[PDB]
Design a protein around this ligand. Sequence first.
Ligand code: COA
Ligand code: COA
Ligand code: COA
Ligand code: UD1
Ligand code: UD1
Ligand code: UD1
Ligand code: GP1
Ligand code: GP1
Ligand code: GP1
Ligand code: CO
Ligand code: MG
Lengths: 450, 450, 450
Amino acid sequence: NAMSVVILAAGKGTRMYSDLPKVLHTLAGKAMVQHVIDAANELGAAHVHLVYGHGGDLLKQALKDDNLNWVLQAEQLGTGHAMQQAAPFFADDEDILMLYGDVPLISVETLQRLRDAKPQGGIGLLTVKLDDPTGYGRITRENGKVTGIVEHKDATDEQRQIQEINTGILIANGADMKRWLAKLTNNNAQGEYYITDIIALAYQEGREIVAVHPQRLSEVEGVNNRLQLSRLERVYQSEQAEKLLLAGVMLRDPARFDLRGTLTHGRDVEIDTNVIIEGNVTLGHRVKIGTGCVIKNSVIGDDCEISPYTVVEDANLAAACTIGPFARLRPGAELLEGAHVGNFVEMKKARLGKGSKAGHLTYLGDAEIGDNVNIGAGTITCNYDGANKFKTIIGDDVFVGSDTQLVAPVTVGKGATIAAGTTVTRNVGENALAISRVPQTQKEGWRRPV
Amino acid sequence: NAMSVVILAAGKGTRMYSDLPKVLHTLAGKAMVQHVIDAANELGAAHVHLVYGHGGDLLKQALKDDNLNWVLQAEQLGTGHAMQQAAPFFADDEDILMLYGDVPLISVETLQRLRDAKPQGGIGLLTVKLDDPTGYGRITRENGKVTGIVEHKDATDEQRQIQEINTGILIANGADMKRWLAKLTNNNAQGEYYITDIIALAYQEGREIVAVHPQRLSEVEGVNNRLQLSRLERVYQSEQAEKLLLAGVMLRDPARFDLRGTLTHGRDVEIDTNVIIEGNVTLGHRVKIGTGCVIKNSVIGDDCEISPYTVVEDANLAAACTIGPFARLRPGAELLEGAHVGNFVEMKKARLGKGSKAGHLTYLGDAEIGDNVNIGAGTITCNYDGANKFKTIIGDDVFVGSDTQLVAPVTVGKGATIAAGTTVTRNVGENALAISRVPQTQKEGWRRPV
Amino acid sequence: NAMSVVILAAGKGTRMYSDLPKVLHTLAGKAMVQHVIDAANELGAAHVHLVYGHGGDLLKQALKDDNLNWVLQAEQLGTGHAMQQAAPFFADDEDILMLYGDVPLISVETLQRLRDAKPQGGIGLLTVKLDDPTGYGRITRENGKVTGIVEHKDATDEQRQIQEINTGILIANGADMKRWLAKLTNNNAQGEYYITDIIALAYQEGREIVAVHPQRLSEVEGVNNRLQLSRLERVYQSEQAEKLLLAGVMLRDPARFDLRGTLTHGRDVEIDTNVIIEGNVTLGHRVKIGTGCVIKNSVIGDDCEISPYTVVEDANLAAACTIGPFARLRPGAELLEGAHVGNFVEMKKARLGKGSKAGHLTYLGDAEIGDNVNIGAGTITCNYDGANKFKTIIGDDVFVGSDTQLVAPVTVGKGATIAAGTTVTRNVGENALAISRVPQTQKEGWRRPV
Ligand SMILES: CC(C)(COP(=O)(O)OP(=O)(O)OC[C@H]1O[C@@H](n2cnc3c(N)ncnc32)[C@H](O)[C@@H]1OP(=O)(O)O)[C@@H](O)C(=O)NCCC(=O)NCCS
Ligand SMILES: CC(C)(COP(=O)(O)OP(=O)(O)OC[C@H]1O[C@@H](n2cnc3c(N)ncnc32)[C@H](O)[C@@H]1OP(=O)(O)O)[C@@H](O)C(=O)NCCC(=O)NCCS
Ligand SMILES: CC(C)(COP(=O)(O)OP(=O)(O)OC[C@H]1O[C@@H](n2cnc3c(N)ncnc32)[C@H](O)[C@@H]1OP(=O)(O)O)[C@@H](O)C(=O)NCCC(=O)NCCS
Ligand SMILES: CC(=O)N[C@H]1[C@@H](OP(=O)(O)OP(=O)(O)OC[C@H]2O[C@@H](n3ccc(=O)[nH]c3=O)[C@H](O)[C@@H]2O)O[C@H](CO)[C@@H](O)[C@@H]1O
Ligand SMILES: CC(=O)N[C@H]1[C@@H](OP(=O)(O)OP(=O)(O)OC[C@H]2O[C@@H](n3ccc(=O)[nH]c3=O)[C@H](O)[C@@H]2O)O[C@H](CO)[C@@H](O)[C@@H]1O
Ligand SMILES: CC(=O)N[C@H]1[C@@H](OP(=O)(O)OP(=O)(O)OC[C@H]2O[C@@H](n3ccc(=O)[nH]c3=O)[C@H](O)[C@@H]2O)O[C@H](CO)[C@@H](O)[C@@H]1O
Ligand SMILES: N[C@H]1[C@@H](OP(=O)(O)O)O[C@H](CO)[C@@H](O)[C@@H]1O
Ligand SMILES: N[C@H]1[C@@H](OP(=O)(O)O)O[C@H](CO)[C@@H](O)[C@@H]1O
Ligand SMILES: N[C@H]1[C@@H](OP(=O)(O)O)O[C@H](CO)[C@@H](O)[C@@H]1O
Ligand SMILES: [Co+2]
Ligand SMILES: [Mg+2]
């Protein structure tokens, strides 16, 4: 059956105290409304209608899904009114599923169950039972059948005793939807147009409304302030962490792990406390990640060991590499098999070859370093002249003495040796020793200042 | 109505296993007793009487509140006895509020409610209902009115069934207080002087005792050991975190955030996991703080981005600065607008000008660096000669080559360039190139040691 | 009474998705089965029989306890069958206690209570009452006495109502054990040999079976997947943290503390958030450890302060040392009294003397540095020539200027001074100034590249 989704996101997020529209606030590194859009497409949505009232410029900048139909609702006259703005775009022969832009954890599995419960010519309604139903629409039933929804403000004390409430999510045929929407009136407690009135309108026509319930309450929780957002962030992180544990990834403390993107992994991966994974990350077999690491958009091969407090972004590590602790890999950093980066070392657009080592206090930027190379502590590639960037090339089997500065562009031939403290401004020949040293001298009986 | 506060803090903290008096142990970076003193002053206390038995030297070193009246209780003969030591200092026409020095979370709002419930000539009592009231004073009532308190040890099995217990906090007129205290006797189960006996003494006189309850149990929890302290630390951090979230500050994980002082902030501030804020910190609008940062007594302007694992103390950052990851700012560090500090960079009593950059492996101490300056990786200001410290001055538009040592005192004129690997011992002229380099030479067929 | 322990660990750990046998997966830095072995020896076990089915090579590599008797069970025909494989090794006059290799938190205190409850000629059984007993053996009783165990699969709906279940742990005389085991048959729902059938076999003989219960459920929880493992890891860390707090160690956040080995400590030690302790660590009095530190197999003297994000392994710090933040001490690092290591400093097989300082951007490897020495920022000991390592010796009262490279082997005499930017290749005399500097020159009107 064909189906499109409508996302109401035109309400004002006042308790957020933000200059950024509420639905753009992120959860696990992704806009709340993007989570909803993803669920809609993942369910099979042909078109996704997004109803907004303001922040349109920022929304269009953040959202780029091709099948997004932007629907304006200049005045927020109620959920019913918002749906009327989008209704003209509904197809007469497709189901229309309504979702909220600020209820990010809704699962496709529950939406699928809701789709299957919807009867021909009727309506699928998602309801939930709460201990305290205060503030939400009450589900009314006659002989076990759903007959309508009464909003909290409009409900009597007795009706307020009803604990089964409307989550807001529902699905119904597009043509039927348009028929009911045209009949909405605003003669109620809030003087708004209630999308909820279509339930009674359908029942009166003899149509059937069936209700299904979410798997978890967190699935239909809405966000109006940052505290509520932080709680859903934890729920999301906890569920993702448990899935990873069940899939064979060892997290030393699942409450101290954050995944903000996608994680691909092999077997026996171990991840210590406080690690953060961002963007798309691929980990090979037996990768070990020490505490506090941050890994973003990077590829890590089999058997790599990432020591504590190492930050990595857009890097590629071959098998058996060891980096950190306190290493900092920036975009373009590449390590070939068995390479090693130690503490207080930074790499940017730089490749380190097989079995090569940069153990300490070093900066490698815009460089190509061969295999079996040893980079002494304190070595620095001077890749910038104040306007342009230049490349440093170091061949295989090179030994670079400590505190050497390589002024790019420059090439050091294979097998060369560079003396400690050297400033390299010209190419170094193969198997040669490069040096630029003042012989050590001494002054006797030197007395330091008082 | 005039009011003074008395804080009993003379009990022995044996289960703390410490050489530091129990009430001096900190919670959120502040002494437990200081939290109580703050609540007393915040309530409007004219005088704060502090009753202590030992550790007086350390207490006087830690506490400096001007309105503190030190009251000695050499022998701990009971709360009643402690109050008798302070009683002579009570004014006949003021209310006297009694608090414990080891119950740090008591809220001014609850104390205010207690003050308002206190009847003329009577007593305001703070009581709470517990599932297991074992160990605490039982509140006795006659026709709904409080008539006394019976200590656990003195109470019969039936009275021990009473679940409403004494939190210990109470308030009453000073003159009345002195009248009852003089009548205390130690003929009871513990052979001590019970401050709790004044409740029955007042009731017998025809005075009225009214009870009020705390908003939260944590508010009246006392600390006798480190475990109990750690629990109140979490409660405190959790409540502060939720307030910040409700005020518009985004905390990526409120359970992994610690504030130990005061935090001032603009809008849309984002704070990642494991950040610690100490002393007084001011954050502008849109400040983003990455994971694990520690910020103490510092000012951070609008739009700054503090990358992961950066430590800052007594620093001042103008708008749009970017620092870290792995940057270390010490007292006196100042960055002007748009300045940048990268990884493994340390600054102390050093100013970096507008749009200036110190991207890596650098130490800047006792320096003034102008605008649009580029500090190459590995640069070091040698500000110390073994006894004295000297200043390094670098004008605008200066380019400092990598691994340059600036031996202070020295001045580098505007527009100058310093060659990589230079040792700068003398002033450099404007628009000039400073250099101290040995030309690179080479020895063919060099064979490294076997 | 003499007693040996048998540990069943031959079951397949399928839901672990690992190439490492399930019982070898670690909890608090120690193999799950090692925790069980430790409990067995700690209880007084004369011999520990370990029944395994595969991964024998890896198991033998990990476990080395001298009193381990390896027992093979090639086919997993049931717990009864596994016990028959070990039974021949049981002594007729010793008690035999059965434990599971994947139930790591079993406490010696509970096992001791179980040993004391075991009646002469009978059986001690460890049982627990669960809300949902689904999946476990049901304890059957006649007039209050345990008469047998019925496995879930074999139990009727009514018997499945029984909530008291078998934890699996039991103890009985070796000779009796062998008598019952020989009678096991596999005519039951799973077609396996149930060790649980010995309960009914003993009762029929007129022997008495007494049941005792664990102190905590976590004590008898078994691990089949990583999620269950992570939960027991938290339970373990939480209990260890609370013990440390009760013993006088201040943990700023007990939920953000991990101990993976042994921690020895003095009084008033303070440990901030996210610290990880590994191997055997000894802390003196008043040691303060800042956030995120990792300390492994090291000794820390009285009054040391370890600043944030410092990593330490196999190091020895005397009293009053201060290191970090961002310091990295590797094996062999030694600091004498009052020594100081600052940020972005690394030490390996290097000793720093009393009151000596290495404040920044430095690497000290294979060195002996005297007292009252000052190591300038950027100093590096070049201890490696590509095949051999050499020692650097620096006497007392030496001042090493910034960015100095010491090419080992070399000795700097007491009282010497080394100029900033020096490359030291030869010994430096006492009280002498060593230097290898090119005088600073200048080129006027230098224009940087466009
Ligand atoms: C250059 C270096 C390799 C020489 O070590 P070495 O051979 O044991 O030292 P030597 O005293 O024998 O000097 C070797 C040569 O350098 C020459 N030399 C010394 N000072 C010189 C200078 N200023 N210019 C040119 N040559 C110089 C000598 O004349 C000699 O030549 P020769 O062998 O033909 O006779 C060494 O000083 C060095 O810089 N090592 C690197 C250490 C390092 O940083 N390692 C990384 C691990 S932390
Ligand atoms: C000094 C430096 C700027 C010169 O680069 P360059 O102009 O392209 O190099 P050149 O080969 O043309 O040498 C330039 C001048 O230096 C002079 N020179 C070379 N060695 C010299 C020495 N020991 N003493 C004095 N002058 C020297 C040349 O004679 C020449 O003079 P000229 O232009 O009047 O003919 C460059 O080597 C340098 O140190 N760059 C800094 C890189 C850096 O650390 N960047 C930070 C980003 S990571
Ligand atoms: C070497 C150093 C100590 C000299 O400082 P200074 O005495 O104030 O400087 P001066 O101008 O007086 O030079 C002192 C001597 O060095 C000599 N000198 C200068 N350049 C020289 C060279 N290339 N070779 C040999 N001697 C040289 C001078 O001739 C002079 O000798 P004299 O005193 O007999 O007349 C200083 O430049 C230095 O390197 N300080 C270390 C700073 C540091 O890194 N501190 C750590 C804290 S961050
Ligand atoms: C009349 C109606 O629908 N009532 C339901 C609505 O309450 P209620 O209408 O009170 O809910 P909200 O005001 O929070 O709005 C719901 C969603 O609709 C959006 N929105 C709202 C009004 C508008 O004019 N434009 C718009 O886009 C909001 O941005 C939000 O995403 O949701 C509750 C669950 O949360 C249900 O129990 C109520 O039965
Ligand atoms: C007789 C009395 O008061 N009983 C109350 C007291 O119990 P109790 O007297 O047992 O309480 P504690 O011994 O903990 O002492 C209470 C407070 O008084 C201080 N202190 C105590 C004795 C002394 O001689 N000097 C002194 O300064 C302690 O340091 C602590 O701050 O508090 C309980 C709540 O915690 C109440 O339910 C009890 O009804
Ligand atoms: C017949 C029997 O014993 N049933 C008990 C067993 O269930 P059950 O037999 O189902 O338990 P498991 O299959 O998990 O095995 C128990 C332990 O024995 C080991 N093992 C099992 C079979 C084998 O052939 N070899 C072997 O070494 C496993 O590795 C594990 O350490 O433990 C439950 C508690 O967890 C008890 O409530 C059940 O009454
Ligand atoms: N300084 C050298 C030393 O490191 P360290 O002595 O710190 O271990 O040996 C390493 C290989 O064993 C080399 O790559 C390093 O350049
Ligand atoms: N090394 C230079 C380079 O950094 P990097 O190449 O690491 O990005 O460019 C920066 C500005 O773009 C300069 O301030 C740095 O001195
Ligand atoms: N650079 C020096 C300075 O450090 P800093 O100025 O950063 O405090 O003084 C210290 C002692 O007071 C010395 O050990 C450092 O070598
Ligand atoms: Co140098
Ligand atoms: Mg250097």
